[PDB]
Subunit: 108 residues, 2 copies
């Protein structure tokens, strides 16, 4: 039914080159039907990861995703200036498809 | 493969109580696998319409969606202040699940 997607942290600031680790928790088992989107300010979300851990074409290798079941992790190995954005997870296991509340990542 | 989602208009301003009609064209036939989301400023997208024309529960009746194939329409029958948001279409016919580029709706 109404699957609730939780996401932590809500916001964070870091330096160029740091490792960033973001979580997304589902309120019910969603198997590996988890997407991660990047939404730069004023733009649409851009799919980065599907099936929990698969990167789409053209996505820089610094992005990775992991998890399965109810707990998921998105990692940026080396934060870059172009990564300033809000990141969202989304499950596509069951309609309606639901979003986490976002993680706003900034530099400094 | 890479389905392109086009959305028009890019931005628009209107008054409280007006009818608003926004369109979304897909670059390939997606049957009726089209979602419409509402994203209020600072928040995550929230699903309003699925299967091109089906409204989710709790969605105000002023919202509607239509279309099938390659052309889709989202309509607000009577614009309200709480409707200031960016609206996005999204296809879920084939991964990756591509987004429209957004329609920014403002009052005044």
């Amino acid at each position: 039914t109404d699957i609730q997607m939780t996401q932590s942290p809500s916001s964070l600031s870091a330096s160029v080159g740091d490792r960033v680790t973001i979580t997304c928790q589902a309120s019910q088992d969603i198997s590996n039907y988890l997407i991660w989107y990047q939404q730069k300010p004023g733009k649409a979300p851009k799919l980065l990861i599907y099936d929990a851990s698969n990167l789409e074409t053209g996505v820089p290798s610094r992005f990775s995703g992991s998890g399965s079941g109810t707990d998921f992790t998105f990692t940026i190995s080396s934060l870059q200036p172009e990564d300033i954005a809000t990141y969202y997870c989304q499950q596509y296991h069951n309609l309606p498809y639901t979003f986490g509340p976002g993680t706003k990542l900034e530099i400094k």
